[PDB]
Amino acid sequence: PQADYSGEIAELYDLVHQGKGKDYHREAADLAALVRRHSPKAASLLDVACGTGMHLRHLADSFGTVEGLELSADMLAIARRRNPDAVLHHGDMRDFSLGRRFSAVTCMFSSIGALAGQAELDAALERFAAHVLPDGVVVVEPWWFPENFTPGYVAAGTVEAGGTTVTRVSHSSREGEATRIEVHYLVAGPDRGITHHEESHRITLFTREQYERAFTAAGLSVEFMPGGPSGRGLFTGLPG
Amino acid sequence: PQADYSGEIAELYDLVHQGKGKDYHREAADLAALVRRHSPKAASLLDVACGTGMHLRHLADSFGTVEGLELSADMLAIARRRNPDAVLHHGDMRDFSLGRRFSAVTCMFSSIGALAGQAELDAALERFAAHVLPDGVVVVEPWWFPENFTPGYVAAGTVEAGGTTVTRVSHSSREGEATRIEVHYLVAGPDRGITHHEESHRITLFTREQYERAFTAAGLSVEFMPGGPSGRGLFTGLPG
Numbered sequence A, B: 001p002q003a004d005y006s007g008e009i010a011e012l013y014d015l016v017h018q019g020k021g022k023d024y025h026r027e028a029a030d031l032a033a034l035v036r037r038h039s040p041k042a043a044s045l046l047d048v049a050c051g052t053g054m055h056l057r058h059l060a061d062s063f064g065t066v067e068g069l070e071l072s073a074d075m076l077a078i079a080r081r082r083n084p085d086a087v088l089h090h091g092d093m094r095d096f097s098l099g100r101r102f103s104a105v106t107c108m109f110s111s112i113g114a115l116a117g118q119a120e121l122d123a124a125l126e127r128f129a130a131h132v133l134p135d136g137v138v139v140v141e142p143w144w145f146p147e148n149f150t151p152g153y154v155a156a157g158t159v160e161a162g163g164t165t166v167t168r169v170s171h172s173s174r175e176g177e178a179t180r181i182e183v184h185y186l187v188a189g190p191d192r193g194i195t196h197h198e199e200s201h202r203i204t205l206f207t208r209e210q211y212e213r214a215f216t217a218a219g220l221s222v223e224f225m226p227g228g229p230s231g232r233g234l235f236t237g238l239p240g
C-alpha cells in the first residue's frame, strides 16, 4: 500500500471525503471566524499540508490572499487546478521557508499527525511561527489524543459520481504511539471495469502536552478547544 | 481470481446474496407452487448446483424428500451443515448419475451459465431428464440472453453481520459469448482488520433457442416464463 497520497488515491480524495460528509465550506467559514476572533484584521492565510486545496478554495472568499504548502505533488496538482490564482508551494512542513508571513497559518484535518515524534512536531511548529505575522494566529487541527482514539474502528461508505462507484473501508489499530490506519477502495464504472486500491498511514497519537510543548517552544501561546471540525478539537497559538 | 466458489468466497456467499435482497423462502414457495401446477402429487426434488443449500432448506418444508448436487466442495460443506438430514452429492451437472428419479429437478440462479457451448448445455439437460420422474418437471433458471444482458453493469452493496462489514462490488462486461463478471469484496471488522477478496466468472450468454434445443434434445417439452426469480425468466420441461 501507499502512504504518499499519490496516483489514484490522490484522485479519489475529494470524492470520498465529501461522501463521508466533510464540509469544507462550513469549516472554512468557522476557521475564518476563529481567525478574525484572535486577529480581527486578518487578510492573508497560509494553509500547510493543503492537500487538494479544498479549504483554500473556500478561505479565498474570506481572505484577500491565500497560499498553500503540500508535500505530495499529486495532491498539489489538484489543488493548483482548484486555486489557479494562488501560490501553492511544493514542500515539507518540517523544513520550509517562504520568505513571507501571513495573518494565519493553518494545518487542518490532522495532517500534523504525519510527523514522527516530538522533534518533527517541534520543527513544524517553529516553521508555522516563522510564517505568522506578529498579530496573527496559528491553527492546528490535531490527530486524536491516545486516550480518545478507538482501536478497531471501522469506517465503510460507498458514493457514486459520473458513472463511477467508489467504496472506501478503513480499519485502524494502535501501533506504538500512533494509529495505523489501513484503507482499501474498490472503484467500478461501466467502461473502466473494477479495480482495487489501498493505502496505509501511521498517524501519531501526540498527547495534548506534546502539542503544547511544540507551540511553546516556537514562541506561541497555546489554547486547545475540544470538538472542532473532526471531533479532535483545534489548537490555536499566538506569537509574542 | 478464483472461478470455483471456494474458500472465503464460499463463506461470503449467503451473507452477500441475502444482503442484496435474495429471498430463498419466497423463491422456494414459488418453485414448489410451480412444481405442483405441473405435477400435483410431487414428493421429491433434486436441486442441481445447489450451492449453499439455501433453496433446499426451504424446499424441505414443501417436499417430502430433497437432495442436491454441487461441484464445489466448499459450497457443499455449507449446504450439508444447513441440510444435515438430506443427501447432497459432490458432482458435476454435466455428467452425474444418482440411480434414482425425483418429482422435480431444479437448477437455479443461473448456475446453468457455468456451462459453455451447446454440447455442455445439452448434456446437462439430458442428465436432468435422466433424473426426473415421468410425471415430474425440470426447472432451469437461465443466465441473461445476449439480447437482454446489460454490459457495463455495476452492483455495489454493503451488509453487516456479527460485527463484520462486508462490501461487494461487481463489474460485468460482454466478453464474447459470455458475461465476464468480476467481483471484489472488502471485509472488515474491529478484531479481524480488513481483507480483500476477488472472484471472476464467465457466465455463458446462451440464446433462448439454445436452451429450448437442450430441453428438446433431452426429450422434454419446454416453456419459458419471462421475469422469474432474478429477471432472467425461467424454463420448465416435462418428459414426453
Ligand SMILES: Cc1cn([C@H]2C[C@H](O)[C@@H](COP(=O)(O)OP(=O)(O)O[C@H]3O[C@H](C)[C@@H](O)[C@H](N)[C@H]3O)O2)c(=O)[nH]c1=O
Pocket: A017, A020, A109, A110, A111, A144, A148, A149, A150, A151, A153, A155, A169, A170, A171, A172, A179, A181, A183, A201, A231
Ligand atoms: C469518529 C472517530 C474516529 N476515530 C479515528 C478512527 C480512524 O483512525 C479515524 C476515522 O477513520 P476514517 O473515517 O476512515 O478516516 P478520516 O476520513 O478521518 O481520515 C483520517 O485518515 C486519513 C487516512 C487521513 O488522510 C486523514 N488526514 C485523517 O483525518 O478516526 C476514533 O478513534 N474515534 C471516533 O469516534
Ligand SMILES: Cc1cn([C@H]2C[C@H](O)[C@@H](COP(=O)(O)OP(=O)(O)O[C@H]3O[C@H](C)[C@@H](O)[C@H](N)[C@H]3O)O2)c(=O)[nH]c1=O
Pocket: B020, B109, B110, B111, B144, B148, B149, B150, B151, B153, B155, B169, B170, B172, B179, B181, B183, B201, B230, B231
Ligand atoms: C439488474 C440487472 C443486471 N444484469 C446483469 C449484470 C450482472 O452480470 C448481473 C448482476 O450481477 P450481480 O448482482 O453482481 O450478480 P448476482 O447477485 O445476480 O449473481 C450473478 O453472478 C454471480 C457471480 C453468480 O454466482 C450468480 N449465480 C449470478 O446470478 O446481471 C442485467 O443484465 N440486467 C439487469 O437489469
Ligand SMILES: Nc1ncnc2c1ncn2[C@@H]1O[C@H](CSCC[C@H](N)C(=O)O)[C@@H](O)[C@H]1O
Pocket: A004, A005, A048, A049, A050, A051, A052, A053, A054, A055, A069, A070, A071, A072, A075, A091, A092, A093, A094, A107, A108, A109, A110, A111, A114
Ligand atoms: N511533511 C509534510 N508536509 C506537508 N504536507 C504533508 C506532509 N506529510 C503529509 N502531508 C500531507 O498532509 C495531507 C494529509 S490529508 C489532509 C489534506 C487537507 N489538509 C484536507 O484537509 O483535506 C496530505 O495532503 C499529505 O500529502
Ligand SMILES: Nc1ncnc2c1ncn2[C@@H]1O[C@H](CSCC[C@H](N)C(=O)O)[C@@H](O)[C@H]1O
Pocket: B004, B005, B048, B049, B050, B051, B052, B054, B055, B069, B070, B071, B072, B075, B091, B092, B093, B094, B107, B108, B109, B110, B111, B114
Ligand atoms: N458443472 C457444475 N456442476 C455443478 N455445480 C456447478 C457446476 N458449475 C458451477 N456449479 C455451481 O453453481 C453454483 C452457482 S451459484 C448458484 C448457487 C445456488 N443454486 C443458489 O441459488 O444460491 C455454484 O455453487 C457453483 O459451484
